[PDB]
Every structure is written in C-alpha cells, then in structure tokens.
Enzyme design. Structure first.
Site, short mmCIF file in Angstrom:
data_model
loop_
_atom_site.label_atom_id
_atom_site.label_comp_id
_atom_site.label_asym_id
_atom_site.label_seq_id
_atom_site.Cartn_x
_atom_site.Cartn_y
_atom_site.Cartn_z
N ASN A 85 46.00 37.31 32.08
CA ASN A 85 45.50 35.99 32.49
C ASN A 85 43.99 35.95 32.67
OD1 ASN A 85 47.63 33.80 32.91
ND2 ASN A 85 48.60 35.58 33.86
N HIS B 111 52.04 31.30 38.70
CA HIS B 111 53.36 31.85 39.02
C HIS B 111 54.31 31.73 37.81
CE1 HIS B 111 56.83 32.91 41.52
NE2 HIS B 111 57.47 31.91 40.93
#
Ligand SMILES: NC1NC(=O)[C@H](CCC[C@@H](c2ccc(C(=O)N[C@@H](CCC(=O)O)C(=O)O)cc2)C(O)(O)C(F)(F)F)[C@H](N)N1
Ligand SMILES: NCC(=O)N[C@@H]1O[C@H](COP(=O)([O-])[O-])[C@H](O)[C@H]1O
Length: 200
Positions: A13, A108
């Site tokens: 990420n 998430h």
C-alpha cells in the site's frame, strides 16, 4: 498536504501511495514513513523512493500512550498534516486518535462493518461470503469503526486461501487508498463537525 505513512510490514500500500502522490496535480506528498518493526520490506521501499524513515519499536515502551507520543514527536518534526495507516498493526491510544481526528486514514481488507479485526480474510473464508472487499476509513478510537470514505467489492473464488484472497483484495486496496488520500488531501472529503463524513 504533508503525509506520514505508518507500516508494520511489506508495504505494498505504501508503494501505491508513493506512486500516486507523484502523479501531476497530487494534493499530497509522503514526507516520512514510520515502522514499529525493524527489517520490514516497507522501509526499503520508502528509502528506494527517497523518503526518510524511522523505526519506533513499540516493545521498548511501557504503554501505548508513550509509544504513541514517540510517533507524534516524529510527526511534528516533519510537520505532517495527514497520517495513513498502511498495514500498521498497533492499536493507537485515545489521545493520539483524538489529536489526529479527521486527519488519519486506515486501509482495512474487508467491506466494513463485516470482518473487523486484523484477520478479516480468515473470517471471510470461514463465513463463506462470495463477495468481500476493502475499506478506507477515518480512524476512530473504536477499532475498524471510523467513518467510511471509500470501499471496493472484490469477489471470493471457491478454493481461495487467505493468501490468494489477500492478494486479490490488495489490488483493490491500491486503487481506493490513493484515491481516498487525494480526496482528504484536497479537502474534497472531510470529517464534518457532526462526526459524519462530508463531501465538498
Ligand atoms: N484506536 C485505533 N483505532 C483504529 O481504528 C486503528 C486502525 C486499526 C487497523 C487494523 C487493526 C485491528 C486489530 C489490531 C490488533 O489487534 N493489534 C494488536 C497487535 C496484533 C498483532 O501483533 O497481530 C495490538 O495490541 O495493537 C491491529 C490492527 C485493521 O484490522 O484494520 C488491519 F487490517 F489493519 F489490521 C488504530 N490503529 N487505533
Ligand atoms: N493499518 C492498515 C493495515 O493493517 N491494512 C491491512 O494490512 C495489510 C498490509 O499490507 P501491506 O504492508 O503490503 O500494505 C493489508 O494490505 C491491509 O488490508
């Protein structure tokens, strides 16, 4: 906006965020990457990108507030506007979260409010959903319960392992996390006074 990214691991990420903030007309720059763990791949990725790093080992602090204050000190040093949690595995104390309210985002790997917690994929597979996904949310004190910014649905394939599903979901993560950072950095998306999400 000046951005910190906190990580605990691989940093896939982090990488998508780096690449996105260097596209033209970006409202964000990554100025520091903090890990709570040494020798994680995310640190190398940050350094290869020319971004300074720190390792703040959480085990060297008596409690969460002290660990969090050490992070905060670094955040001030680099006058950070926004914090992104990108595979960060430490729950942050009340006072830190309150201080960064409206300015701290998390990725998430489920469609919240389903499968809160760090093992969302294991839960998705156990439950037998055919559709899962990922969520970018503002961080609130309650874990995985802050206001939802963006989400993307991702199919579960019959015979998926945690590894295969995880990889498929990370591909979606790498789209919505940079998109959500741009939205918050540009002021297009804010945490409104009423505690609810606001689009300008
Ligand atoms: N107060 C507060 N509120 C938040 O909403 C934060 C965002 C949490 C992000 C996730 C999350 C949920 C639970 C944990 C957790 O149990 N941490 C343990 C350490 C567990 C471990 O080492 O495996 C510990 O003791 O800290 C770690 C991360 C996540 O499930 O979404 C995922 F995917 F990141 F894992 C936050 N950091 N602090
Ligand atoms: N604090 C948010 C974070 O825990 N999110 C979840 O942890 C993994 C990190 O992978 P990565 O190190 O390759 O980006 C997952 O990619 C992400 O869903």
């Amino acid at each position: 906006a000046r951005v910190a990214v906190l990580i605990s691991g691989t940093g896939s990420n982090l990488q998508a965020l780096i690449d996105s903030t260097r596209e033209p007309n970006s409202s964000a720059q990554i100025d520091i990457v903090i890990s709570n763990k040494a020798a994680v791949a995310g640190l190398d990725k940050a350094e290869r990108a020319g971004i300074p790093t720190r390792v703040i080992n959480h085990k060297l602090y008596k409690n969460r507030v002290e660990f969090d204050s050490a992070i905060d000190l670094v955040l001030e040093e680099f006058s950070i506007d926004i914090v992104c949690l990108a595979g960060f595995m430490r729950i942050l104390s009340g006072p830190f979260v309150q201080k960064w309210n409206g300015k701290m985002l998390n990725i998430h790997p489920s469609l919240l409010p389903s499968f809160k917690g760090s093992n969302a994929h294991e839960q998705a597979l156990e439950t037998g959903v055919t559709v899962t996904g990922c969520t970018v949310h503002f961080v609130a004190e309650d874990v995985d319960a802050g206001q939802i910014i963006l989400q993307e649905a991702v199919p579960v394939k019959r015979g998926d392992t945690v590894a295969t599903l995880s990889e498929r979901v990370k591909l979606a993560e790498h789209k919505i996390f940079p998109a959500a950072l741009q939205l918050v950095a540009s002021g297009t998306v804010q945490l409104g006074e009423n505690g609810k999400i606001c689009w300008v």
